[PDB]
C-alpha cells in the first residue's frame, strides 16, 4: 500500500525511506489541518538538543528503569507552553522510550499540571510500544538516552515513533549520540537539517492562520535549554494569572 | 424409487419437528439409509442415534464392517470398549468386544491406520491379565501382517520371557514354531526362485539354527517357567543342571 | 580456586568516553561521516587497528562496538577492499564487523552489495584460512571468529551472493571426501546419483588443473575441517586446564554443524560426509564432553547435533519419514548385520541367533560386540562401509572404544521425538529456570554459544518447525517465570529462623506461604502412556492480607497456572538481599514446580464451581485450592525418589506463587503445540511448502493458483 492519509508529508518523510513507494493521499496536501503551521512554534517538526541538566545525563535508579530529568522537565515545559497558547490538552500526547521515564514524567505532571485547570493533563503518558495503533495530532517524545542508542537503534521502534504524529512531532534528545548512529541517519539528517534549539513564537496564539513553512510575521524567540524554557513558561504563567486577576478585579 | 426425494422428506421431517418425533423417524430412515451405497449419509445418520440408542452402535459397527469401513469401525469399537457401561443385543462382554476389536485390527494393518495398535493391545495386556499368551500371538499376528516378521519373533521371545505357566508356554511355543516353520519354508522357496545370494542362503541357515535353538531351549525354558513360579524349587534346579 | 568471574553488565560507552577514545580519533581523521575533509585511505590504519585495538584487547566486545559505532565497515574497509591489498589484518577485520552486526541483529550483508565482485576472492581466502594449521598463521580464537562468520554465511542462503559460494561447497561433488566403499554404497542405494557422479568425474577431467585442484579443496573443505577439528578436539586434555580458545572453537564448530543439518539444502549432501567422518563418535568419546564445567554447553550442542543428524527425514527427497519407515530402515540395518554376522563371523553366531529386539538395545549391542576382538569389530564396520577394509595381517589403527561406539550408535533404537515430548514436563523446574546456558540472564554478553533452536527461513519438516517454536515459547515463558519468582520471593524475604525453620518477614501480592500440601489422587496411566493421566493435589493458604489482594487470590479460576516453590534460606533474619548476587544463594530456593488450579475448595472438600457471581463468602482467613500437578514431572520425581533416594519434592513446598492472568496462558498454549505435533498437520498443499521456505514462494499467489 503506497499512499498514507494520516500524517503530514514532512512528517511522512521521516519514515518513508523504509518503504518502497510510500506517497501521500491528495487530501494531505489540500486539507487546512495539514497545511496550517503549529501555532507558536516555528517548525512543524524539530529535534531539540537537551544537554546534561546539573551535570546529570540519563539516570538508572533500578536496572533498566531509565530516566532523564532534563528531557522530562523540558517536555512538560513545552507541553505547558502549548496549553497556555490555547492548545487543547487532549491534542497533545507524551511518549517516551522507557517505562522509567514515563513514571518520572507523570510525577512532574501531577506536581505542576494535574490540578491546574488552565493546562490539565495530557491525553496519554505511555511507552512508544504501548502507543502502537493509536495516534494524536501532536506528540512530544523523550529519547532519554545519552550513553547508547541500542533500544532506538532497532529502526522498527524509530518508524513507529515518527509515525505517531499527525501534525507535529518534537523530539528531545542527546543529538550528538544519535547523529553518529548509521541506521538512524536517513531520518536524523532531516531532523538535524533544522536548528537544534527550540524556536518559539510566543505572540502567536492558537489557532494560527499561518501556513506551515511560511515565514512568521513576528520575531522568533530561540530557547537554548530547559532552564531558560522553565523560567519563561513560569513567567508567562504568572503573567497570565495576573492579567486574569486584573480582569476579575476590574469586573469587580 | 425416488431416493433423492425420500431423504429430503426425512431431512425436512427432522428439521420440522422435535427430537421426540425424530425417534419415530430414525428406525425407518436408518433402515432406508442402509439399503444404498451412500456411506457418508448413513454414517451421519447412525451417529445421531447412538446417544439415544447404544445398541445401534453394534448395528453401526456391523454397517461399517459390511461397508468395509474397518478403520471407522475400529475407532467406534475402541471408544465402546473404553465406554464399559455399553449395552449389547448379544449380551457380549467387554473382553469379547475388545477381542472383536483386535480380530478386525489384527486382520487389517493396512485398513486400520488412525490407531496406535501396539498401545491398545498392551493396554489390553494390563487389563486382561490372564489372557496374555493369546494376546501376544494376536499382537505377533498383526506384526506378521505388517511384514515385520522379525518383530513377530521379538513378541514371541518377549512372550516366552513374560509367561509363567506351561499351559501358556505351550501355546506360545507351538505358534512360534509354526511361524518359524513357515518362514523357513518361505526362505527355501525364495532362495531357489530368486537365486541364492550368500546372505540369503545364510539367512535360511540362521532361521533353521534358530529353530534348532528353539527346540533345544524348550526343556531349559520349560524348567525356567517352573522356576519363575517357584525359585525355591530345588528339584527343578537339579533338572536344570541335568540339562546343562 | 578463584570463583568464576560474574557477568559484568557491559555498560556501553558514553559520548564523553566515545569522543575521548583513540579509535574515534582515527575515525574522525579517516572515515567518520559528519566530517567533510577525510584523509585518504591507508592500509596501515587497518593493521594499526587490528594489532593495537582488536588483538591486544583480546577481541574485547567494547572495542569492537566502538569500531561498529564509528562505521568502520561501511566507510573504510569494504569500500577500499580489493583482492590485491587483502592482508590477514584486512581479512579478519571485516569478519569481526559482520559477526558484531549479527550479534546486534542489524543488516550485515548490505555493504557487500556495493562491490559484489570482490567477495568470491575474499571468501576463498577465508576457506584457506579456515584450513590453516592450528599452530600456523591463525590462532584458534581467530579461527573461532572465522567459524562464526562461516556459520552466519551458511544461515544466510536468501542472499544470492552468499548462496552462490555456499552451493559450490555443498553439492553432490563434495562426496569425493567419502570412503570409496561408502561412496559406492550410497550410489548403489540411489542409482540416479551414480549417473550424475560419473558426469561429475567427466566434468573434472575437462577442467584446467588449477581450477580443478581449487574445486577439489572446496569439495573436501568441510571434510578436512572435521579432520582438523578432531585433531584440535583430541588435543583437549581430560584433567589439565584447557585454553578457552579450544572450547569456543569446538562449540562454534558444532553450532556450524547443527545449522548445516538444520537446513534441508545443506543437509542433503553434507550429512553423508558428516556420517562418514564419524564426528559424533569422536565427540561423544572425547575428553571435552567428560569435562563437566568446560564441556556442558558443548555437550548440549552435541546432543542437538545428534538430534538433527538422526532426524526422521528422507535427505534426498525432503519428505518426512514415518515411524513405520524408520522402523523398517532400522530392521533393514539389523537384518543386514545379522546376515553379515552369521556368514562371516562364528563368534557372532551367538549374537545372530537372537532376534532383533534381543540385540537392538544399546545395552545388548555393547553386550554382544564388547567381548569381540578389535580386528573382528573393524571387519564388521568395513563390511557396513563405515571404515576402510582391514588388511588381513594388520591391527586396526582405531581404538576399540571407537569401534564399539560406532557399531552401537549406528544400530541403537532411536527414541521417538513425540515420545520424548510426551514424557517431557511442561512446567520448567529450578534446574532449567536458572540454567544460564539455556535461559540466559539479562546480563548475557552474547559472547558464548547458546544451545537454542533458531527460527530460520527454512525448516526440515513441519515437525521440526513446531518443535523449534515450542522450545522457544517454553523458554521465553520460563524467563518470565524467573522474573516472577525473583520479584515475589524477594518481597516475601525468606530468612533462617533460630530453630532452622522459615520465617517470612515480608509479603508479596503475587505469592503466599503454603499452610498445607497433600497429594490427593494419582490416576492410572492411559493406553500407551508411562505417566499418570492426572495428578491432583490440595494447597491450603492463609489469606490474612488486604481485601483487594484476597479477592485476587480467591478470584483464581479453573485452568489458572500457579507455581509451587520451596525455599530453605541459609541467611539470618534481617539480611538484605543484594540483586547483583545470585538469587538462589540468597533466598535458599530448592525446588520450583508448576501446577494448574482446578478451583478453590469449600469446607466439605468439594471444588467450588466457577458459577456466575456472587461466590460464597467462605469463613475466616484460610482457603484451600485443589490443583493439578504436571504428570510427567510427578512421574520423574517419584522415579528419582525411588531410584536415586532423593527426597520427596512434594513434601517440601512452602510458597505458592500466582502469575498475572494475561501472561499465565503459556501451559495451555504449550499443550496446543504438543497436540499439533501429535496430529497430522494437514496444511493446504498450496500453502505447505511456502511455510517451510521451499519451492516457488509465489505458488499460492492468485496469478499462479489454478482456481483463480
Swiss-Prot record, chain B:
HAT repeats lie at residues 1-35, 37-69, 75-107, 112-145, 147-182. Disulfide bonds: none annotated. It is found in: Nucleus. Coiled coil: none annotated. It comes from the Eukaryota. Associates with RNA polymerase II, the TCR-specific proteins CKN1/CSA and ERCC6/CSB, and XPA. Identified in the spliceosome C complex. Component of the XAB2 complex, a multimeric protein complex composed of XAB2, PRPF19, AQR, ZNF830, ISY1, and PPIE. Identified in a pentameric intron-binding (IB) complex composed of AQR, XAB2, ISY1, ZNF830 and PPIE that is incorporated into the spliceosome as a preassembled complex. The IB complex does not contain PRPF19. Belongs to the crooked-neck family. Involved in pre-mRNA splicing as component of the spliceosome. Involved in transcription-coupled repair (TCR), transcription and pre-mRNA splicing. This is Pre-mRNA-splicing factor SYF1. It comes from Homo sapiens (Human). The gene is XAB2. The chain holds residues 124 to 367 of 855 of the full protein.
Swiss-Prot record, chain C:
GO terms for cellular component: catalytic step 2 spliceosome; membrane; nucleoplasm; nucleus; U2-type catalytic step 2 spliceosome. It is found in: Nucleus; Nucleus, Nucleoplasm. Keywords: Acetylation, ATP-binding, Helicase, Hydrolase, mRNA processing, mRNA splicing, Nucleotide-binding, Nucleus, RNA-binding, Spliceosome. The keyword Nucleotide-binding applies. The keyword RNA-binding applies. GO terms for biological process: mRNA splicing, via spliceosome. Residues 1-416 are annotated as: Helical region with structural similarity to ARM repeat domains. GO terms for molecular function: 3'-5' RNA helicase activity; ATP binding; ATP hydrolysis activity; mRNA binding; RNA binding; single-stranded RNA binding. Involved in pre-mRNA splicing as component of the spliceosome. Intron-binding spliceosomal protein required to link pre-mRNA splicing and snoRNP (small nucleolar ribonucleoprotein) biogenesis. Plays a key role in position-dependent assembly of intron-encoded box C/D small snoRNP, splicing being required for snoRNP assembly. May act by helping the folding of the snoRNA sequence. Binds to intron of pre-mRNAs in a sequence-independent manner, contacting the region between snoRNA and the branchpoint of introns (40 nucleotides upstream of the branchpoint) during the late stages of splicing. Contains an N-terminal domain with structural similarity to ARM repeat regions; this domain functions as a scaffold for protein-protein interactions, but is not required for RNA binding or for ATP-dependent RNA helicase activity. Identified in the spliceosome C complex. Component of the XAB2 complex, a multimeric protein complex composed of XAB2, PRPF19, AQR, ZNF830, ISY1, and PPIE. Identified in a pentameric intron-binding (IB) complex composed of AQR, XAB2, ISY1, ZNF830 and PPIE that is incorporated into the spliceosome as a preassembled complex. The IB complex does not contain PRPF19. Within the spliceosome, interacts with SNRPA1, SF3B1, SF3B3, SF3A1 and SF3A2. Belongs to the CWF11 family. This is RNA helicase aquarius. It comes from Homo sapiens. The lineage of its organism: Eukaryota, Metazoa, Chordata, Craniata, Vertebrata.
